[PDB]
Each structure stands twice: as structure tokens, then as C-alpha cells.
């Protein structure tokens, strides 16, 4: 449900094939928030409970509304926190394909992490999905240093955070359908395109 720590809790001797690291939006609970469980259930259907570890970014990521105003749209302490989960993934389970996602502040956190990540771990992320990406206009729909074909951005018409603002309007809260169909679909498809472990 809203907290999943499958990578922290997982046994290295029994590595899943796919690890999803997800960062939640502002003020959301647990470490998955309102969209993370939906995507998680569908990935579990595609690969089985033991084929996929779902890991949310917790620890120092507080998902404080105010940090959207910071230079990268998130605190440096949250970037260090997600960066460390990508590095735990790569060390615990080197053969696993990674996938990532984020909503609102977590889409800006997912883009800032991936931009700073070591290239050999970044290249292991077969697909990333961003919902209501606060840096969409600034970054022209891309995550820096990361292929356009592996990125999918869900930005609703009228979601002001997609169009250079930080005003939260109603379309910003309307990504439940996407998290239920299109986004797991894109992720399962990018993972099957390269394969698993």
C-alpha cells in the first residue's frame, strides 16, 4: 500500500529481475503516495511478486511543498537520498533492469537524480515515467542525459506545473487513470524490450 521498501528489505541472494524506485509528490504519505500503489500492483501482475522489487524514496525525502521552489525543484538531501537507492540497487542486484517514476516534486527529484547518476547505472534504467513534471517546460520534456525514447511524461492540459509554474490547479491531481493503465504499460514494455535478468 503506501510504503514499500522491497530493495532495502530484499535478500541479495534472491534478487528480483526488475527493481522500480518511485518518488512521491508533495505532502503524500508513506513513500509511494497516491499513484505509486496502482503502478506497483500492475507491475506485480506482469512479473510476479518475486520478479519485481518496488522501492519508494523515503528517508531524507520529506516531500515538503516548499522545496519545489529550490533550484532543481527539490532539496539536495532528497537527490542524495534517491541517488543512494539507485546505488544500493546496482550493488545488491547488478543484473536487474531498473525502472523509475515520480510525481510532482518526485518527478523533479527523479529527473535530478538521473541527471547526476553514474552513467553505468543510469543506462540500466530501461524506462522512466513522470507525472505532472514541474520541470517540463524548463527541461523541454526531457530528463537531462537520458534518452527521449526511455522517458514518458504525463502532463495534463491545465496542469500549470507542466507549463513553467508552481500553482497547483485541479488537473495536477488527476493522474489516477494514467498511473492505472498507460504508465505501467510503458514500463512493462521498456523492460520487455531489453528483458529482466
Helix or strand run (H / E) with residue 131: strand 125-131
Which structural domain range is residue 64 located in?
A: 1-197
Active-site residue, from 67, 104, 113, 178: 104
Q: How many structural domains comprise the chain?
A: 1
Cβ atoms within 10 Å of 118's Cβ, excluding its own: 12
Report the CATH number that the domain containing residue 38 is assigned in CATH: 3.40.50.1820
C-alpha–C-alpha distance, residues 124 and 107, integer Å: 18
Active-site residue, from 38, 67, 113, 172: 172
Expressed in Å, this structure's resolution amounts to 2.1
What grid cell was written down for 70?
529550490
Is residue 104 among the annotated active site residues? yes
Three-class SS state of 74: coil
Active-site residue, from 159, 165, 178, 197: 159
DSSP class per residue in 16-60: -SEEEEEE--TT--TTTTTTHHHHHHHHHHHH-GGGEEEEE--TT
C-alpha–C-alpha distance, residues 178 and 196, integer Å: 23
**Backbone break loci in the chain, preceding residues, C–N > 2.5 A:** none
Experimental method: X-ray
Is residue 159 among the annotated active site residues? yes
Is residue 170 within 8 A of residue 143, CB to CB? The reply is no
Amino acid at each position: 500500500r503506501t510504503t514499500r521498501d522491497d530493495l532495502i528489505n530484499g535478500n541479495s541472494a534472491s534478487c528480483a529481475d526488475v527493481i522500480f524506485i518511485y518518488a512521491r509528490g508533495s505532502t503524500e504519505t508513506g513513500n509511494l503516495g497516491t499513484l505509486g500503489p496502482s503502478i506497483a500492483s500492475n507491475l506485480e501482475s506482469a512479473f510476479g511478486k518475486d520478479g519485481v522489487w518496488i522501492q519508494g524514496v523515503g528517508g531524507a525525502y520529506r516531500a515538503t511543498l516548499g522545496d519545489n521552489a529550490l533550484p532543481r525543484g527539490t532539496s539536495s538531501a532528497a537527490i542524495r537520498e534517491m541517488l543512494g537507492l539507485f546505488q544500493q540497487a546496482n550493488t545488491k542486484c547488478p543484473d536487474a533492469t531498473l525502472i523509475a517514476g515520480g510525481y510532482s516534486l518526485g518527478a523533479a527529484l527523479a529527473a535530478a537524480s538521473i541527471e547526476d547518476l553514474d552513467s553505468a547505472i543510469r543506462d540500466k534504467i530501461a524506462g522512466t515515467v513522470l507525472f505532472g513534471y514541474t520541470k517540463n517546460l524548463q527541461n523541454r520534456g526531457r530528463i537531462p542525459n537520458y534518452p527521449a525514447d526511455r522517458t514518458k511524461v504525463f502532463c495534463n492540459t491545465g496542469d500549470l506545473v507542466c507549463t513553467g509554474s508552481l500553482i497547483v490547479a485541479a488537473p495536477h491531481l488527476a493522474y489516477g487513470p494514467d498511473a492505472r493503465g498507460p504508465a505501467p504499460e510503458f514500463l512493462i514494455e521498456k523492460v520487455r524490450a531489453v528483458r529482466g535478468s
